[PDB]
Symmetry: D2
Subunit: 242 residues, 4 copies
Amino acid sequence: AQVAIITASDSGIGKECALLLAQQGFDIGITWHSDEEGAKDTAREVVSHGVRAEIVQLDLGNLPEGALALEKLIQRLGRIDVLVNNAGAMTKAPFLDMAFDEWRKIFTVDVDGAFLCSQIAARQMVKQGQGGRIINITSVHEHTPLPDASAYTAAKHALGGLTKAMALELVRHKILVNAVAPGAIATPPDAEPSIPLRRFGATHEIASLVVWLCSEGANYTTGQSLIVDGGFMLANPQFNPE
Amino acid sequence: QVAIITASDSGIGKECALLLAQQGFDIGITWHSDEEGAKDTAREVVSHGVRAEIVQLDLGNLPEGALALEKLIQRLGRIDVLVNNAGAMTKAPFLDMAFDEWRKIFTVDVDGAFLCSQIAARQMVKQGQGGRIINITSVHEHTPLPDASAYTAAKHALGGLTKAMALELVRHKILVNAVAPGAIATPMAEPSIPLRRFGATHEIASLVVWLCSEGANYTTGQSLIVDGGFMLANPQF
Amino acid sequence: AQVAIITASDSGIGKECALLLAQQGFDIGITWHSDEEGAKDTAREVVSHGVRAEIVQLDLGNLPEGALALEKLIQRLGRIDVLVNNAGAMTKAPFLDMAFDEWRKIFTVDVDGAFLCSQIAARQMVKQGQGGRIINITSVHEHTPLPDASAYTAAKHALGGLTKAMALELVRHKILVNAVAPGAIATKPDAEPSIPLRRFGATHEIASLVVWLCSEGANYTTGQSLIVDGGFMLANPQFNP
Amino acid sequence: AQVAIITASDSGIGKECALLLAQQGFDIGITWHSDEEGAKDTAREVVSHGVRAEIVQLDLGNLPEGALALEKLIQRLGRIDVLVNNAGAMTKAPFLDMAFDEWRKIFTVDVDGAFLCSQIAARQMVKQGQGGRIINITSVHEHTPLPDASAYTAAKHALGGLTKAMALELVRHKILVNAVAPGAIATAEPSIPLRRFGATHEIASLVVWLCSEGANYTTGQSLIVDGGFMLANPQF
Ligand SMILES: [Ca+2]
Ligand SMILES: [Ca+2]
Ligand SMILES: [Ca+2]
Ligand SMILES: [Ca+2]
């Protein structure tokens, strides 16, 4: 089979990517930071689709050595064709008060892990000589700021820039690199008038685009940030309800 | 369900019609050029067990020419998907371009999509079941050509209309996006492009199909660029 | 003296660009599509700064022939160094109901005028061989939509595209082409909580940037859309007034 | 006088910002991470304009403690009205071979410094209650990649995001936050549409404009000064 690895997987977007790719016949790897039972839970659901599931701890508290877990996971699965760098929870902190270690921790978890995992995956894809795909889950805040989450905004921008740089630098290896940039996604209702579509997105509505990016139809798409946001990016003071 | 491709061609238009026919959409086609290509596409659509209906929609006769889309919607019974396909690129140096040439490029490249989108959106509102409008633009929605100022300006216009329709039609659950191709190989190495080849028509049509899927229900107001890395390239590349 | 021409001038941004450029030593041309008396008042104020002012009518209801008034104005000023294509009033019309003639009229007034004026100015700049500047007044709606003004949004996008295309195509002539994209401008503090800076902009706050774009300091700037908007573009659904 | 401080100053854009703001009558603070002699040359030229010049080392190899040099510089000048976070040199490393230490060094020098300096300046501006300006010198690579400088590209994007976040978060204090994004600056070229490198004064001139009252409605933007670099696609 092709092999897809979802890094920093969670019960939301990351789990939904794992399951939809398992249903497409990919063997799946999962990395986890602290939530081993959630990773084991997803792995059991993946195995129910008749593909392989392998998990490993990738400790974002112990970079860069901690990232060598992905090498071991690739060795166990035999190859890698797809890396999906899933986004962790949003950490907020007021700009004026934010401790330097909190600024650094948000970059460590939200960019540095994706950097190290992307480099390991890309080195394996070059070794195989069969191309590959790297898909970074970012946010609308790759593009437009939060008013109370400056580190989170800056790190999403950083992962956007890394996405473009990897796309250009790795294109020669036929490694396609893109971001999927979610808006406000419900992780299980009243209308949400602040969003043009007037609801939160579903995890499936992000994972579906990841699946398309893993299809042969996506073979001309690289260097892009594909925004799935219910119109969040269209909102401005002439729309925003008072 | 019904998908209509306006200003269809033997490239992206045909491949959208065929992939949507295979998802079980009845197909409408309008043509401004290559009627025989539209008829060939309709014959191949019918081989997939769905309906194919075609009309001329003459972009040299706007606005009255656009009423052909009302006739096509009447014949197919409804519309769920509109794909506004893009015509050929016309180049013309800026300093000496005739005003009529400038206006003709806006007529063909945005006025047609405007009128088709209004007719489709009215029908989708009447149905009450939402809909999808997909505008085929260009990388030149975003970045210029050095010798095609009218084409560039009209692609940008269609990108702005995409955003405006997306926001204005959103409470009717009509999702509006652009697919922005780079250099595509059509019936009608490239070291300059990072992937070092032209795109295939199926690599545009594939994304149009995804935008017609339930998985795309949260996607609106966007311009999805399918360009082999064209947008990444600069004088440092 | 260098010459700056402000096309489709008004008592707002266009007037303030004329007055601030007169104060930087530019002879001024003004074209008017509306408000003839305002154009004459601007001219009288410009001449107080010790430079020339010339005005013509340029009727956007008579394109293309009406644009030839700009050739007469350039002749009368002897040269052109700067063209400022000023933006007219925004027209709102619902998308589903909009008449096709309404759609086309917005493109005529908001893109086609700037196209023909830019061609005439660029031809003269090329013949002079001394470079030039074309500055298009667009809008934040070059970039983000209105909810009820699809034609205005599309036409501002079009003028943004034309800005980039002219910048690339005219670069060998050292003709620098940019857009200044205003937000909500008064034509005050804490009166507008929907905007992050909590007020409308002043005409001076647009014209000041136009003045900078006409300075030698701006000689490396081309192809850009410089947004002056009190943070309008930042006001996503998570902005709290 | 109003006070402008140039952080991570150099003999190019940083010096020219200091000189052109001194001409407008700003007292000047200079921090240096490299080229101490250049910071002293800048100060010498600044005082010719009849304003104060104060210099400190701000060591980006010693963060976060090193950033407290900016608190000392503000104390010496009495206030701050303008912070210009100047950009250091571009560092390249191939993506597949890049060490984690190289990635981290580039984020330390190209983002973390600007973050800590911006926080210190913004706190002072809030304490004063008189508004202020923060101007980040980024790059065209805030927007478009290098093909062989992925860390530099990511870090410039990061600083672009921080610029937007600070613009929105600090707006109630009337602290205006923008980036100036240079192309290729000299400190004929047929790869660049205008066929030359930019001059340091063609960047500093825009920074001076952003420090004027006419710029009082500009916040959250990245103003690209690049000779058309961004327009040059595979069709140029
Ligand atoms: Ca379970
Ligand atoms: Ca016929
Ligand atoms: Ca000149
Ligand atoms: Ca102040």
